[PDB]
Amino acid sequence: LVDDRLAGEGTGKILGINDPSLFWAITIVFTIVWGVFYVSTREIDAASDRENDDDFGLTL
Amino acid sequence: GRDQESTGFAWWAGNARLINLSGKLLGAHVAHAGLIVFWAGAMNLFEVAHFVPEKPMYEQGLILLPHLATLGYGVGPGGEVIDTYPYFVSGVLHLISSAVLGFGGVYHSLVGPETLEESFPFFGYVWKDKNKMTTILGIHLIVLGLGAWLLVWKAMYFGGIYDTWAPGGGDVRIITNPTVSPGVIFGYLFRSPFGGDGWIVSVDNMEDVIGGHIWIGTLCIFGGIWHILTKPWAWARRAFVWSGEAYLSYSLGAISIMGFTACCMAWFNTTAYPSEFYGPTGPEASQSQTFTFLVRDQRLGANVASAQGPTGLGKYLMRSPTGEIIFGGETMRFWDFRGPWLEPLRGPNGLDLNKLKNDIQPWQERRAAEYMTHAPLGSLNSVGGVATEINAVNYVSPRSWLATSHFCLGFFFFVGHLWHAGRARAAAAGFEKGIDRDNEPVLSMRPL
Amino acid sequence: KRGWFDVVDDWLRRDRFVFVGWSGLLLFPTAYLALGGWFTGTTFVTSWYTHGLASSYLEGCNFLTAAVSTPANSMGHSLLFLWGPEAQGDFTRWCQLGGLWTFVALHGSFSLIGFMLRQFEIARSVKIRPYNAIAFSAPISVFVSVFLIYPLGQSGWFFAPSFGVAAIFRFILFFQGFHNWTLNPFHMMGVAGVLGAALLCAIHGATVENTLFEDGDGANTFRAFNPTQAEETYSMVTANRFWSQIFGVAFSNKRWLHFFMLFVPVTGLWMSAIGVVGLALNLRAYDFVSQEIRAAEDPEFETFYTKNILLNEGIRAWMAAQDQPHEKLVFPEEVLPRGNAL
Amino acid sequence: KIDISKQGLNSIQNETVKLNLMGKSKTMESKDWVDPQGRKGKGYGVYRFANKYGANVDGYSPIYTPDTWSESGDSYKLGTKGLIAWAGLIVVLLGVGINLVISTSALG
Amino acid sequence: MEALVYTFLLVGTLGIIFFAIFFREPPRIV
Amino acid sequence: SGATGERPFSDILTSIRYWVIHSITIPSLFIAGWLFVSTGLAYDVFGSPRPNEYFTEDRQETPLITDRFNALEQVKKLSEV
Amino acid sequence: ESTSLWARFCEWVTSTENRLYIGWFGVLMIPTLLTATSVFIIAFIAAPPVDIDGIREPVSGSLLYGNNIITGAIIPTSNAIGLHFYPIWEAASLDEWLYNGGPYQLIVCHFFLGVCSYMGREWELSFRLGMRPWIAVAYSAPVAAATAVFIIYPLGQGSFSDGMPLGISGTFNFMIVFQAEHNILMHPFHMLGVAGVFGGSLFSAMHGSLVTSSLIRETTENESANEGYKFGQEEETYNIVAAHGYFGRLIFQYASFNNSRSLHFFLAAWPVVGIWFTALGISTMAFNLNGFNFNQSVVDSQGRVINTWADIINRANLGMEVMHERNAHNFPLDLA
Ligand SMILES: CCCCCCCCCCCCCCCCCC(=O)OC[C@H](CO[C@@H]1O[C@H](CO[C@H]2O[C@H](CO)[C@H](O)[C@H](O)[C@H]2O)[C@H](O)[C@H](O)[C@H]1O)OC(=O)CCCCCCCCCCCCCCCCC
Ligand code: CLA
Ligand code: CLA
Ligand code: CLA
Ligand SMILES: CCCCCCCCCCCCCCCC(=O)OC[C@H](CO[C@@H]1O[C@H](CS(=O)(=O)O)[C@@H](O)[C@H](O)[C@H]1O)OC(=O)CCCCCCCCCCCCCCC
Ligand SMILES: CC1=C(/C=C/C(C)=C/C=C/C(C)=C/C=C/C=C(C)/C=C/C=C(C)/C=C/C2=C(C)CCCC2(C)C)C(C)(C)CCC1
Ligand SMILES: CC1=C(/C=C/C(C)=C/C=C/C(C)=C\C=C/C=C(C)/C=C/C=C(C)/C=C/C2=C(C)CCCC2(C)C)C(C)(C)CCC1
Ligand SMILES: CC1=C(/C=C/C(C)=C\C=C\C(C)=C\C=C\C=C(C)\C=C\C=C(C)\C=C\C2=C(C)CCCC2(C)C)C(C)(C)CCC1
Ligand code: OEX
Ligand SMILES: [Cl-]
């Protein structure tokens, strides 16, 4: 061949993960954002002035 | 019924009066179910009555019979229709079943109880009941799993399924080893929708189709049992509007995706939509044209391998941007096409020049010749051919009808998501009837 | 005792179901004939002798293909009167000669004058400002420039748009092939006016319906209104803040909003009418000479503009023989421009 | 203001239709009323300014006012005598019309 | 030259949009 | 709001007299239009060519009017059976 | 009260005190639309010629390559690419990526996500401001049209080269070829679309003129009538009854909307429904369900074909069909 390319186009890879580094990128970023979300769930709900019980939720 | 005086909904929004009337709402959904079953039976009998063996299925404007053919009813080797009685009994069975379905819909709507809660606690529900809602979701999720298992039971134990890729020619084949490996199943779900990948539209053998419906049947049954024995968690209760119109919008969004997926399935897929019954796909006809002329020009004497077109690219054969040998011309875009007629002439490197030069069978030439003259091109008044055609042939491909109709339905049901979801949040928050003049929210907000 | 003008004025401007007015003495007679001319022509009159075409339901046309076709090109700009020197009182021959087209165009153009006068007469009686009439000036400019001014600059009425659905489509396709009307900056302003007006119509309608005040308890919000109420029916403050944060800019003056809804469409149609006046004299923005000179000097320079010029060559050559039968073009196949294969 | 009794809506047989055409709704007037979707009414009726202005758009400008209808239209003056003559003429003209269509056609 | 005049006209038009949004006359109630 | 002193259309279209009168007038107008085409009168009044007289033994192609001031004579020749 | 980073971040994102409302759709809209905008500006000014037909014949579309504003365009992706996903990292070099039409796919993909997020952002602000929804429903009509010409039509036709070029002259080429291959003018959905814009343009002028004609006198003649309206006025700035009295007499009384709420729904429904259908028209014609074909429909007694205005339209279609993409077809049928 003449030059080098990823050669992943049109190959049906899961999520386009040609190399494992892409897997780490998606997993690490998601875990971080979920991590900061996880520690804030109680505060976010407290504003509702209601407990997140079985009756909690915008309902009509 | 009711009126606008006691409801506030006008006649053009009349079915909105059934939101909190469980019994009458049940009748409405059972009645529309009778309508769906009625159409399936009525069109099945209509298509059978208007079916002639002198022409293939896709030339006669049939869209239901090809579905029955793919299930391996009344078809023989090569896609020939050998019997029409299985199509008849299917049509009658739906037509009669719609009558009992209509009676229940008519009964549960007019005569039956208006609300099911007091008299039938098992069926009674209130939309805000997250638990009861998941049980109904869980139950109807199991019946979907059982429906998926019926497909694999038929393909493995009851006659089999039509396999257009079957060795020795396409025929009804009993699937014995469905592809159940997780890597294959997850491979279809998480591949890109772009060319070459095609998401789930690219499923190319009936082992994967049946293996896939085994996963769906198992997931739905487990998901049905899970959603029956549990109730939504805290993160789910704070992420969704728990009202009747909100649940409707959730399905409208989901059904919108399915409509678009069906539109692409009928347009591209040649495995679950065999070309022997639905006609050639857009790509198939384009590939068929270059194949037809290559065969004719070789017979008239020409090295199709080294024939150069006006642009300098190969006239009959060229290389795809990844190196595979593909048909030349404007069909280069459809190099991903894979059909039961062209695959035998395709080695690991692409099209085989030796096979294309000495080992092209007449049935392959006949298949490609037929497909190029039944390309999906057609007009609204059913005049086959490009827009610059004359009124000679009355033909529009069933794929064209299925792709266009179920895209229009898919898009309108997306607007259904937008409409019925925006209103569900507004109705629940409490400002779906307008801004309150006493406390307008913007007035409290500081100036911008 | 009251004078004739006063007695007639009383009856003409009576408040009845269908207002007549003085302008009705011009509108209704002419408007009825123009309506009647189109229906009669599209149902029984043929275009066999003026165009070599069938354009009546009687011949076998749909609503899409039936039309009142223009006269032949040999007639030039003849007014084609029933008593005119071309057809002298012979009604059936007058219809075959295409005289029904000038009938509709002439009686129809005066009905437009009669309708704009109807708007002025009713506005004055009701004692309101006359901006609807000023607005209707834009449709009149389009009709005058296209159906009257444009053929008057060409060989004859033959090149005017024939009153039909498919006939207008031919007229539209003719302008692309022969005038490059898409490239004309005046159709461009007209397109922006029409697409801009359609945008304004949808946004204003949606914004009002989604900033309504809660003036009732029913979900049917249409009923919570009264035409004589003093309060506004929707929140302009809420509407202004929504579009200020979504789009960055929003209307704060309701009067300016509605004048704009009137200015965009009218200005757009008027600009188009200026462009068609240019096309009457073939003063068309057909080509960019700098790109054509460049393309002639290197066979590598390609732009979408040069690709359209090649498309116009195909339209002109393949359409002229039948579209212009008077030219008696006998183009053999080899001389028509066509690309490889297809 | 607007007097709903003088809008020509007083002879509608069905009271629900009469209330709909008047733009009024006793049920929605109650503050304990509940919308079919579960929303509780705020106390207004169909229109909150009905008392200030007399009515809604429906009351203000109805398009179905049977009171203004002429009483002569309630009955056919010629009675059964004109009615049987109508039935006789319909049959006669129907037969003549069918004969004309067949006679003037390229049938057969 | 033309390419320079086309770019200035385009970025000039974009510059007006920026000012019309952020340096706008604020709408004030009464 | 308010009426211009004319009978409401709903009153007229619900009255028996209207249907007794229009049960004959409307059908007659329909048959009148039918007989206009059926009898061939339309072809002779508007000069539309019957489907068997577009082309004549002499002229096998489309007609073409060329003389403006002799168009009446020329169209009669082109329309001649 | 908000102390957690995410709680404070989510309060800032959903804040209605920002000059421009960011939302959760805004965290999708802003990055995608800025990506598409920046690539569009760079490619429109200085991008190399793109081989669109896959026949190795580059087409120039940038200002620095001898285009003006009218002819300049972003050329669609190469016909060799087809529907294949062609990001930057799938190319050996940026020069190869520019040659094969990479920017078009990048712009279209991020733009499609942007307008979908822009539609969601419109709903979100309404929910935060306590308004009714369905401004986004009205905006779905132009969104559907954009996806039809940029996404769905390439999908049906099988190549992004058949998407609409991002240019003024490029747009016209897209329309002309569309008529030749699908006869869009004779499609009933472009007809409903034209009624949508002609009707919308009519109703915009009628509504604007009627309201302007009924302004209540609140100024003098040395100032604009617009001065009569003060932002935040409780009362109406024009007499609805006066405008209804005029329009109900211009035609007849019951052809006019005395209901202002009904009038504005009609003002919204008519263009939105019209543009919905014309968007479906392009989407349907993506799967080769073309417009009405009445060619050689009228035939005489002896079998000769009597042409109509449809046949004249066909001759124009033949001209465009044989001349579009001259060096791209090797076989007579334009199946692709
Ligand atoms: C206002 C409302 C707007 C609505 C817009 C709606 C559009 C409808 C489409 C998609 C959106 C709906 C949701 C998904 C539906 C399923 C789409 C799909 O099944 O997708 C695939 C289908 C069909 O794909 C085709 O699948 C085919 C499979 O056939 C193969 O296999 C077949 C079976 O054997 C045959 O053998 C055949 O011969 C063989 O070639 C081929 O592989 C084709 O090359 C391949 O294109 O449609 C496609 O191609 C789609 C191409 C990609 C989408 C278009 C670009 C959009 C880009 C967005 C931003 C970029 C990326 C993010 C996107 C998504 C992120 C998750
Ligand atoms: C799939 C279509 C469908 C279905 C299943 C329903 C179902 C229903 N609607 Mg509805 N509706 C629809 C479409 C539909 N609608 C449409 C398109 C509109 C707009 C015009 C409306 C507008 C509307 C309004 C305004 C109202 C309803 C109401 C109702 C409910 C009760 C009707 C009633 O009791 O009055 C009685 C109706 C009749 C007695 C008519 C008798 C005709 C029968 C039922 C049809 C049977 C024909 C069939 C051939 C017989 C089959 C028999 C079988 C054994 C073979 C009911 C559950 C009412 C409601 O909300 O309840 C509170 C009500 O107010 N609808
Ligand atoms: C039409 C079928 C259906 C419907 C309407 C619902 C609806 C619901 N489910 Mg359920 N579920 C289903 C099927 C269904 N489920 C099936 C078949 C299973 C078995 C796998 C489950 C297992 C399940 C679990 C374990 C949970 C729910 C939960 C919920 C609730 C939260 C909704 C949510 O946040 O999801 C939104 C989805 C996400 C936030 C993540 C997106 C991931 C999707 C699937 C994209 C990934 C695509 C890819 C192909 C999936 C790979 C899966 C693999 C097995 C093939 C909700 C009411 C939650 C709950 O409330 O508990 C009671 C909960 O934790 N479901
Ligand atoms: C508002 C009424 C109105 C108006 C403005 C027009 C206008 C027009 N008609 Mg039309 N027409 C009308 C009603 C009207 N018509 C009616 C009711 C019929 C019968 C159904 C017709 C039938 C008709 C036909 C058949 C034709 C026209 C044609 C024309 C056009 C040119 C021919 C022409 O006007 O003759 C000449 C111009 C004039 C006569 C204007 C001069 C007016 C002066 C002031 C009269 C002075 C009178 C004089 C002192 C003598 C007094 C005599 C007596 C009172 C003692 C023209 C634009 C022709 C056409 O369509 O062109 C293709 C055509 O052939 N009309
Ligand atoms: C986008 C980048 C630049 C692109 C430039 C392209 C040219 C066309 C667009 C600019 C010309 C039109 C703007 C008209 C301004 C107007 O009417 O409002 C007047 C504004 C409003 O602010 C005033 O501010 C006042 C506050 S105070 O009084 O100053 O404190 C306050 O009352 C209110 O806001 C207002 O009155 O007054 C100003 O303070 C603006 C400064 C003067 C305008 C600058 C023009 C040149 C911009 C830069 C050009 C070089 C670009 C290259 C940069 C490296
Ligand atoms: C609720 C309601 C509604 C609806 C309803 C419905 C929707 C119903 C349905 C119903 C139905 C859904 C019905 C069905 C029926 C069916 C039937 C009854 C069948 C029968 C059959 C038969 C009779 C036979 C046949 C045959 C055979 C056997 C074979 C072949 C031949 C034949 C075809 C002959 C509405 C809207 C009105 C409104 C009101 C309310
Ligand atoms: C059968 C078969 C198959 C398949 C299978 C399967 C297994 C499927 C599945 C699938 C799945 C398994 C899934 C799908 C889809 C999903 C989705 C589509 C999701 C949705 C959700 C969402 C979208 C979300 C929502 C929410 C959340 C929670 C978050 C935030 C936001 C909200 C709230 C909204 C195959 C291909 C192999 C072959 C052929 C056939
Ligand atoms: C021109 C002429 C004349 C006149 C005539 C007239 C004046 C009138 C006629 C008139 C008329 C007035 C006719 C009409 C006809 C009508 C028709 C033919 C109708 C049609 C319609 C239809 C077909 C319908 C459709 C529809 C729509 C629109 C909507 C939906 C539904 C439907 C589809 C049904 C005279 C003698 C002066 C002399 C000169 C010549
Ligand atoms: O690329 Mn654009 O235009 Ca859709 O057809 Mn085939 O491909 Mn090409 O030709 Mn015709
Ligand atoms: Cl080709």
PDB file of C-alpha atoms and ligand atoms in Angstrom, chain B residues 134 137 141 144 185-186 189-190 199 215-216 218-224 226-227 230-233 235-237 239-240 242 258, ligand 3:
ATOM      1  CA  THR B 134     -45.577  -1.605  35.356  1.00  0.00           C
ATOM      2  CA  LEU B 137     -46.484  -3.151  31.070  1.00  0.00           C
ATOM      3  CA  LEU B 141     -44.348  -7.481  27.599  1.00  0.00           C
ATOM      4  CA  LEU B 144     -44.792  -9.942  23.108  1.00  0.00           C
ATOM      5  CA  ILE B 185     -26.367  -9.991  18.517  1.00  0.00           C
ATOM      6  CA  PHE B 186     -24.651  -6.990  20.093  1.00  0.00           C
ATOM      7  CA  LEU B 189     -27.437  -3.456  17.732  1.00  0.00           C
ATOM      8  CA  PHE B 190     -24.420  -1.175  18.183  1.00  0.00           C
ATOM      9  CA  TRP B 199     -27.446  -1.102  11.910  1.00  0.00           C
ATOM     10  CA  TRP B 215     -33.017 -12.961  22.418  1.00  0.00           C
ATOM     11  CA  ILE B 216     -36.067 -10.711  22.077  1.00  0.00           C
ATOM     12  CA  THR B 218     -36.147 -14.164  26.257  1.00  0.00           C
ATOM     13  CA  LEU B 219     -35.563 -10.494  27.099  1.00  0.00           C
ATOM     14  CA  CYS B 220     -39.266  -9.657  26.926  1.00  0.00           C
ATOM     15  CA  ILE B 221     -40.215 -12.589  29.159  1.00  0.00           C
ATOM     16  CA  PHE B 222     -37.532 -11.686  31.697  1.00  0.00           C
ATOM     17  CA  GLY B 223     -38.343  -8.004  31.294  1.00  0.00           C
ATOM     18  CA  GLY B 224     -42.020  -8.815  31.665  1.00  0.00           C
ATOM     19  CA  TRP B 226     -39.073  -8.054  36.131  1.00  0.00           C
ATOM     20  CA  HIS B 227     -41.549  -5.244  35.491  1.00  0.00           C
ATOM     21  CA  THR B 230     -40.915  -4.575  40.786  1.00  0.00           C
ATOM     22  CA  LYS B 231     -41.943  -0.928  40.737  1.00  0.00           C
ATOM     23  CA  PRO B 232     -40.057   2.052  39.295  1.00  0.00           C
ATOM     24  CA  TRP B 233     -37.051   3.114  41.337  1.00  0.00           C
ATOM     25  CA  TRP B 235     -34.260   7.618  39.694  1.00  0.00           C
ATOM     26  CA  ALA B 236     -37.101   6.561  37.360  1.00  0.00           C
ATOM     27  CA  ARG B 237     -39.844   8.275  39.443  1.00  0.00           C
ATOM     28  CA  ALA B 239     -37.215  11.256  35.393  1.00  0.00           C
ATOM     29  CA  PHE B 240     -40.693  10.634  33.897  1.00  0.00           C
ATOM     30  CA  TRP B 242     -46.559   9.613  35.327  1.00  0.00           C
ATOM     31  CA  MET B 258     -40.019   1.385  14.489  1.00  0.00           C
TER      32      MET B 258
HETATM   33  C1  CLA H   3     -41.587  -2.007  25.762  1.00  0.00           C
HETATM   34  C2  CLA H   3     -40.751  -2.615  26.858  1.00  0.00           C
HETATM   35  C3  CLA H   3     -40.315  -1.893  28.076  1.00  0.00           C
HETATM   36  C4  CLA H   3     -40.730  -0.709  28.614  1.00  0.00           C
HETATM   37  C5  CLA H   3     -41.781   0.230  28.125  1.00  0.00           C
HETATM   38  C6  CLA H   3     -39.950  -0.512  29.800  1.00  0.00           C
HETATM   39  C7  CLA H   3     -40.039   0.578  30.682  1.00  0.00           C
HETATM   40  C8  CLA H   3     -39.295   0.845  31.838  1.00  0.00           C
HETATM   41  N1  CLA H   3     -38.317   0.066  32.331  1.00  0.00           N
HETATM   42 MG1  CLA H   3     -37.774  -1.879  31.455  1.00  0.00          MG
HETATM   43  N2  CLA H   3     -37.079  -3.676  30.619  1.00  0.00           N
HETATM   44  C9  CLA H   3     -37.571  -4.216  29.522  1.00  0.00           C
HETATM   45  C10 CLA H   3     -38.570  -3.589  28.760  1.00  0.00           C
HETATM   46  C11 CLA H   3     -39.270  -2.406  28.942  1.00  0.00           C
HETATM   47  N3  CLA H   3     -39.090  -1.548  29.946  1.00  0.00           N
HETATM   48  C12 CLA H   3     -36.964  -5.516  29.186  1.00  0.00           C
HETATM   49  C13 CLA H   3     -37.293  -6.379  28.002  1.00  0.00           C
HETATM   50  C14 CLA H   3     -36.053  -5.715  30.183  1.00  0.00           C
HETATM   51  C15 CLA H   3     -35.132  -6.891  30.351  1.00  0.00           C
HETATM   52  C16 CLA H   3     -33.782  -6.506  29.797  1.00  0.00           C
HETATM   53  C17 CLA H   3     -36.139  -4.566  31.069  1.00  0.00           C
HETATM   54  C18 CLA H   3     -35.400  -4.365  32.228  1.00  0.00           C
HETATM   55  C19 CLA H   3     -35.480  -3.214  33.036  1.00  0.00           C
HETATM   56  C20 CLA H   3     -34.653  -2.929  34.187  1.00  0.00           C
HETATM   57  C21 CLA H   3     -33.533  -3.675  34.840  1.00  0.00           C
HETATM   58  C22 CLA H   3     -35.126  -1.703  34.633  1.00  0.00           C
HETATM   59  C23 CLA H   3     -36.159  -1.301  33.799  1.00  0.00           C
HETATM   60  C24 CLA H   3     -36.681  -0.077  34.190  1.00  0.00           C
HETATM   61  C25 CLA H   3     -37.789   0.602  33.428  1.00  0.00           C
HETATM   62  C26 CLA H   3     -38.446   1.892  33.789  1.00  0.00           C
HETATM   63  C27 CLA H   3     -37.401   2.985  33.611  1.00  0.00           C
HETATM   64  C28 CLA H   3     -37.367   3.481  32.173  1.00  0.00           C
HETATM   65  C29 CLA H   3     -35.968   3.833  31.763  1.00  0.00           C
HETATM   66  O1  CLA H   3     -35.335   4.626  32.434  1.00  0.00           O
HETATM   67  O2  CLA H   3     -35.473   3.292  30.673  1.00  0.00           O
HETATM   68  C30 CLA H   3     -34.532   4.072  29.885  1.00  0.00           C
HETATM   69  C31 CLA H   3     -33.278   3.432  29.353  1.00  0.00           C
HETATM   70  C32 CLA H   3     -32.089   3.872  29.769  1.00  0.00           C
HETATM   71  C33 CLA H   3     -31.972   4.990  30.760  1.00  0.00           C
HETATM   72  C34 CLA H   3     -30.794   3.277  29.285  1.00  0.00           C
HETATM   73  C35 CLA H   3     -30.822   3.180  27.770  1.00  0.00           C
HETATM   74  C36 CLA H   3     -30.428   1.780  27.332  1.00  0.00           C
HETATM   75  C37 CLA H   3     -31.203   1.414  26.079  1.00  0.00           C
HETATM   76  C38 CLA H   3     -31.775   0.005  26.187  1.00  0.00           C
HETATM   77  C39 CLA H   3     -30.297   1.584  24.867  1.00  0.00           C
HETATM   78  C40 CLA H   3     -29.343   0.411  24.720  1.00  0.00           C
HETATM   79  C41 CLA H   3     -29.589  -0.292  23.394  1.00  0.00           C
HETATM   80  C42 CLA H   3     -29.108  -1.734  23.452  1.00  0.00           C
HETATM   81  C43 CLA H   3     -29.555  -2.512  22.220  1.00  0.00           C
HETATM   82  C44 CLA H   3     -29.559  -2.394  24.751  1.00  0.00           C
HETATM   83  C45 CLA H   3     -28.712  -3.616  25.088  1.00  0.00           C
HETATM   84  C46 CLA H   3     -29.495  -4.560  25.989  1.00  0.00           C
HETATM   85  C47 CLA H   3     -29.131  -6.011  25.713  1.00  0.00           C
HETATM   86  C48 CLA H   3     -29.789  -6.924  26.737  1.00  0.00           C
HETATM   87  C49 CLA H   3     -29.505  -6.415  24.293  1.00  0.00           C
HETATM   88  C50 CLA H   3     -39.514   2.039  32.704  1.00  0.00           C
HETATM   89  C51 CLA H   3     -40.930   2.294  33.173  1.00  0.00           C
HETATM   90  C52 CLA H   3     -35.972   0.362  35.449  1.00  0.00           C
HETATM   91  C53 CLA H   3     -36.913   0.338  36.611  1.00  0.00           C
HETATM   92  O3  CLA H   3     -37.640   1.280  36.847  1.00  0.00           O
HETATM   93  O4  CLA H   3     -36.972  -0.720  37.403  1.00  0.00           O
HETATM   94  C54 CLA H   3     -38.278  -1.127  37.790  1.00  0.00           C
HETATM   95  C55 CLA H   3     -34.934  -0.693  35.649  1.00  0.00           C
HETATM   96  O5  CLA H   3     -33.953  -0.575  36.356  1.00  0.00           O
HETATM   97  N4  CLA H   3     -36.387  -2.235  32.810  1.00  0.00           N
END
